[PDB]
dna-directed RNA polymerase, mitochondrial
Amino acid sequence: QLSGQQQRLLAFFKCCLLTDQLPLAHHLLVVHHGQRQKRKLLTLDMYNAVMLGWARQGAFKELVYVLFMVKDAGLTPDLLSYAAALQCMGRQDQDAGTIERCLEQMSQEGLKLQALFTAVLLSEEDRATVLKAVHKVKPTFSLPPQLPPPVNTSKLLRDVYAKDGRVSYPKLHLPLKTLQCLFEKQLHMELASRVCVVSVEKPTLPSKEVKHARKTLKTLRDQWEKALCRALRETKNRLEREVYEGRFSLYPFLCLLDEREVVRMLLQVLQALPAQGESFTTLARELSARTFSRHVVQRQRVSGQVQALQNHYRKYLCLLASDAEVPEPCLPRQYWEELGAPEALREQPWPLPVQMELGKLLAEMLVQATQMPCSLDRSSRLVPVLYHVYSFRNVQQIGILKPHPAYVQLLEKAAEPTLTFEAVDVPMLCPPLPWTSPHSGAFLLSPTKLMRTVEGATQHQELLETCPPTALHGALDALTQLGNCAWRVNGRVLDLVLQLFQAKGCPQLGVPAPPSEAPQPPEAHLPHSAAPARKAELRRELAHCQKVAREMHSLRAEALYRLSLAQHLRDRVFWLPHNMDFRGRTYPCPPHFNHLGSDVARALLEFAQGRPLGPHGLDWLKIHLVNLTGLKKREPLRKRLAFAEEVMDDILDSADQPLTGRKWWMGAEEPWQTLACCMEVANAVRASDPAAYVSHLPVHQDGSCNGLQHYAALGRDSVGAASVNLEPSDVPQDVYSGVAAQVEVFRRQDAQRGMRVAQVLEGFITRKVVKQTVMTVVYGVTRYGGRLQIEKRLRELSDFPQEFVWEASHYLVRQVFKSLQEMFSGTRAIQHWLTESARLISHMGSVVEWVTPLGVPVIQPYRLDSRKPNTRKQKNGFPPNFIHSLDSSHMMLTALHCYRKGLTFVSVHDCYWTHAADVSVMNQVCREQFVRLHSEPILQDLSRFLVKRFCSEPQKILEASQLKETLQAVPKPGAFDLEQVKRSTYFFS
Amino acid sequence: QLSGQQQRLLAFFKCCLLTDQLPLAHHLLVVHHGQRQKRKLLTLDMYNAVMLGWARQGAFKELVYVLFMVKDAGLTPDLLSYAAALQCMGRQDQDAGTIERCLEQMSQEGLKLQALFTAVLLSEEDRATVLKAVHKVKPTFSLPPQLPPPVNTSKLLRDVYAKDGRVSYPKLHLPLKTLQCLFEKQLHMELASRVCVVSVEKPTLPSKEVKHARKTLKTLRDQWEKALCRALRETKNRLEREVYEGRFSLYPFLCLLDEREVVRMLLQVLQALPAQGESFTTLARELSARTFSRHVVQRQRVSGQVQALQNHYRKYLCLLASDAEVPEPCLPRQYWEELGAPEALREQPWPLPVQMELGKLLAEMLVQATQMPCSLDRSSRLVPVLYHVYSFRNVQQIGILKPHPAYVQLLEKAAEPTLTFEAVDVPMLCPPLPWTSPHSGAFLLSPTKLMRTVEGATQHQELLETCPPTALHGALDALTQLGNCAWRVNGRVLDLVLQLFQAKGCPQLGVPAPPSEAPQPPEAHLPHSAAPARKAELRRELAHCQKVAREMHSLRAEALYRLSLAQHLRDRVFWLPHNMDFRGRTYPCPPHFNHLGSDVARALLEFAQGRPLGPHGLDWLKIHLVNLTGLKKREPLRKRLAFAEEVMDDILDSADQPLTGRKWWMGAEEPWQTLACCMEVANAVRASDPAAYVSHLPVHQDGSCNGLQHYAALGRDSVGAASVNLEPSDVPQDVYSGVAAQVEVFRRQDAQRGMRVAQVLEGFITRKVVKQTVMTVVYGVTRYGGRLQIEKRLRELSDFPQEFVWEASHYLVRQVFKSLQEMFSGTRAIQHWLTESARLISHMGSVVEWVTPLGVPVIQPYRLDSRKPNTRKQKNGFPPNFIHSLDSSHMMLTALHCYRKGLTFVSVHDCYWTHAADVSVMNQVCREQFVRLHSEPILQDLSRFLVKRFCSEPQKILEASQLKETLQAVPKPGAFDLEQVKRSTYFFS
DNA sequence: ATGGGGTAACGACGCCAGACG
RNA sequence: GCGGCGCGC
DNA sequence: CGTCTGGCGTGCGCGCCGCTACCCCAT
RNA sequence: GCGGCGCGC
């Protein structure tokens, strides 16, 4: 039985081991034990913590005193109690008589000597001292024979790890000594926990204003630093005094990080606090996360772990480096594990009440300590820089910490030329650390979760450690691979985007406009004599202008961070480590700047390593260019290539004079990507030998309605497989056009019936209007969500009568759903089977759990405030989540197999990227791996799993009989020959 | 179904009627009604509040809109809804058609027109406007014929109110015009809410220190006043903005009192905040009480109620004044009610969550606004004057608000010559207001509770209003009488007490010593070379010196307030209004200075009106003197009088040269009272005609072991009645000596048996050792509590070996209880009957309730966190509480009947006081009234009551049958003839 | 020189309520 | 709110 | 359906002060 | 935490 207070106390004792504040930890334990009502709150794990702390000091008299309290409680000593005593005996070099007696008191409890080294979490120092003691009584005591590492034998992963086969794993274009410097630069960045980047904004403000504003701010910052140093020591003294009395306090937690680092962290948070304010809770969570992250770094820094990482990583780089070889071929994770690998030590995170109290302590400490004169430019009265405000719109009042408006104006006048980011929020300057487990990988020192999903994190975090270590190999390697791709900035694109940004912007080309371009009200109120209705007319006009200004400012701020980081990484090679969500779907860890983004964002990036085009590279660059224009969507590949040749003059003019020429590229569906591609095609054709032109531009091959593609494969549906290009055809099949055409026929019928909305919608049913809905309904979009997607497309039409936007989107979403239910009757059966199976599993008070064909366990976190499962989210979420785990498995298999063939592979879920030189092989692998994945009886295996995992309960059998009946009701497959996907050009195109 | 949030919202709407902030109240109601989840939180009483507020403004359109919301909710309009609408119709002078329709929509709901004026709480303005509307449709509508007032017909109270009999009600020595000035002085004091009194401390501090300290403090106080004015307006703006959003806030509550008064109140609280600190909760309760009290005063001030009180009270004084007559004789309450009496209007107090939040708001506002430089005497850095600290000794951490130590030293150096008190904390400068109901009486403007008891206040507060109005007449008149006694200070005693106080004090004569006389450690630590045991020896010595210093400082502070108020009231006549606890036992309202106190306190006071001694006054002064010495306790009255004649030289010398003569008075049991009495006897014998000497000194007649006296009467026990002087004897019977003698015989037996404690206790068993225990065991003292009382008496013996204090007090308390159980076997049976009856009543989940023979309902508040009754406190508390309600009834009857005979009567529960001239009549009345009270079948009536009140439950009958069996098991009375009490000299002596 | 920063760690016994047989 | 005392019955 | 055990509260009315202790480094 | 937007699939 765990408790809120017990969680706090146990965390306190464990914290004192990190700070070595054993007399403080012992005092609290003694005080608690000596009090009748407090003693009950203590646990064997708490006594043990203090016991292990004294063992490490060689404090036998204190360890013995804690053993007395345990027996007095009156609890019984376990494996950790005996491991602590032996450690103390080894360290103090105790007599064999005392050790033998401890080893025999252990045998009487029924505890085993060999069960201690397997079940107890110990450091290499803690392990060593216990052995020294045992070797004094039992000198012929040997630990189990190790360490032979196991390879994953999974049906689909077998040939990824098998030594049998010719591997051609890729290496970087950079030499060993270059990569070591890059490692040092990243290491330096992570030790600081901060990155300072020059802002791409301004400079348009007079110097006399700026100079004084900067001088005032530097002085105030000197005042806050001193104030915060003082506040931190005073807080530490107050909390220390609470421990001197029998009470828990966050005192040892504040003792985990250097006081100078805590103040630097708080001053960073103050400078970056948004003007509008921030949710106190959010700030508390962040402040707690930044403290923990910096303490982890500090612990490594002071324990020789950084020096150990330097030696390990510098050896590891031989696998990657151009001018270096390895003894035998292997994957990055395999070589990382071969070189070391004592796998260091794992630190369990804090209980959420400790996380929140610490964050709130520091937040309130910052509010309390930071004072400033409100008198601005004799500046007598001091006021707090920060203040609490409450948003009463939520119905449940949330607290916001907002800066003083004078402080906001001061920083604005100061016009500071730098922006600061956390080291884990920006791309890595060196190849990431390979993912070796769910707690080791990505960033060098700072900890990273393998699974992003915060909701139900405890249940998913434990199950990744629960499963066989080999089970996660596929996912761990696919993530290591994605993170291993070297990126660089397209300098030419950046200069053009900055030219527009640093002027009036260009919203038409997705570049935000500065506040100067915000709509002004024509004209500011001219009252009061007339008129009450005209005064309200201006108020609604002003409200809309304020709305647009706020919206423009949001986009401007978001672009500012993205562009400032791109400007920062301009002349550098960088890497994007990857993470997973609960479904297995992969995402980059640095959020601001990356390839999962918009057109401007994707155009700014290219592979750092190029690859000579070869005999078909240039044609692939030409097809990709045309794909990006969105002009020949319905056309076959040969006609897309023929179109590129026709518009070749406009491609070259677009490349040469982007903003001053005929600006052909600006009309593309993806203009910045088209322009980047025009630049690549121009460089290629203008090279001495285009087939030898070293090309860096990624080329994309995407699966059309990938959710439906998976459903067509699962149900072997011939009608469905034809619609979404599983079945070969010489022309691509567009389901979006298919839906729009069918909806128009429905609209024509309804308009004749007398229906008013169908009559106004004449000539408005287009692919663009329905596209997002057709695409996302397979991913769980409902008629409510779909109406909103269609509304957005109707509002942007101008010719469309905006009086009808609600009734038209409401009509269109029902028509879109109707078309899809007819076109995908087969899919509908599988969707209904999964939905019903989940509904019944959740109704029995258990969340839906399954395992991917690559051995990744998936658990739905949807529960309601143990916490009962949220039956609605569980049933509605299972078919999309199940489909996502399959597309995720497909992507991972494609990545892993492309790597063996020497390809650079990145993806945006169902959009696969590689160099133009290697598009054919990627497509071969993509199709082969889809066919291999879906050739298995996925629905049958899932059914047999759900039967074993949820139909085992001895009482009740009645709910399990109704469940078994629905799980075994697996929909029968259609006629489609899955092998045909291998011969299908437009499957991924 | 009431709620915490609902209580807050209802309080908010009611508050807006007092502030007339109807657009604010309406907005919150509208916002709440318009929201799905908030609408449910609203109640008909809340809608009605806003509805009545608009009615008062004549806002028919808004009243109608609120009526819509009520029906929409969808609730039904009640009597208050219809009274509000009619008020609005009368005030706006609406047509008869709209009124007739409202009067007929009322008839359809089943509501009655005459049921409105009886069940609805309305002002004389609210009553008048509703009638004006009704008289337009029903002109021949007449209210019930009134107001004939009823007299109490109770068996024991009948002759107190009956016109049949010769009354000689006393009048004051002061003329009418003098009393009106005194009324004006008190009125002025209450309007300010403060009394400034010169401290009787110092002056021993240099002027250069003081001057600068005062100058610094005046400046800081100017800074805090401005800061607090600003903080209050800023708080009011924040809270106002919470109401603009749909949220409740304390905004209208802050709008009840002038901003200048709120700041004056907070500045008063800051100056008086104790240096050690104060429980935040306590401070919150006080701050809320001071706001409510000042708002009540402000409301009267601005509504003409003060001018109405002036006219009423100035007419009332004719009954009291020496130079004024009344038409017919009557009691103060009767004349007060005859002159007026529209009984003004009652204001219901705030819900406890509102009381606590408001107090905490103001407390935090004071902490937040008050800043001071810590640099003391270039004083750069500002720090808060107040800060939060936590006491972790309680196990449950309580928050304390403590002043900054520099601020404490500043006020100490400043040596401010004044102390400030709340107007209700000091005696009245004019006769109090008569108690007319449980909500009207005592102080002129400030509200006073009739019942003190805070625990279970709601249950007792409602039952006093529940019972027939006549039922409380006896208690209300007895309290008015006690409050009507005019007091003055004995100047001679004050000068002597101040002489000792302003020097080194005199602890032997109960005058505290200044910190200069505190024990010093001989001598301050001389370390470090030697020795660890001697270093700890000094630590225990220092700890004890700190303990004694803290104890001396507490007594000094307590005396300082008492003496400063006595010095303030030196040349003035003052009155002490009285209150009751739940048992009916009476207490004075001003706590610091009064006759219920110590020897020094009781000696400082005398009656303001004197009474010529007459033929037996001087002898009574002589008996009283001897009584106070404690020298002739066992002696008859004639021998006490004979002793006074023998020591007459020492009485005169003591009076003449108190601190320089033979100091005979200093050896008395009550030295300051003996000295006051020596001064009175000297003035009397030295007067031209001692029988005509106008004497002011109160003479005391007390009932020996009054708890047992009541038990001996109830059980008609002859053995018991003899022991506690119910049975006449020529010598007084001392139960304390009786117990001590018996315990010594037990000790002699045990010492011979071999018992170690009995052997050490030889020669230590005295009356003083057992006295308090013998006295208080009847009032619920247990063996635990009794051991502690005996411990105190053992520790003060010096000859007694202090090693044995625990085992000796443990032995003595069992022996004391054993003696009492033998001596009072009869009592034991009644105690066991009441204890058992209560145990069973409480076991059924109901608190013990009864009614006094004077018609006062008593309810035990003992419950545990509806709240179930605390069975232990209910059973153990019933016999003492039942006995107290009888002694209380006896006191009240004695007071009421002494008043008819023209006596000045005060009491200290079972100690009755009057002038020496009137001791015989008081004793006649005391005995007559005891016999009259106990002549009734008190146990039988109580049994018949408990049978009716607790044996009426239809299911279960099994618990009620076991209860009926124990309630009807009334112990049979003994032989004692209760009529003998009338002939008993030492009953009260 | 002194305010405040830093840090050090004998006793009883009825009563019920929940935990047991 | 607990504690230390004091006082009263 | 009875017997064992452990934590709770031990008279209540009023008043005060205290809320850990203190060395010795800092201003 | 809600909201407003934007982007991605």
Chain B is about 55% helix and 10% strand. Chain B has one domain: 1-989. Chain B touches chain A at residues 35, 37-38, 242, 245-247, 382, 390, 392-393, 395, 397 (CB under 8 Å).
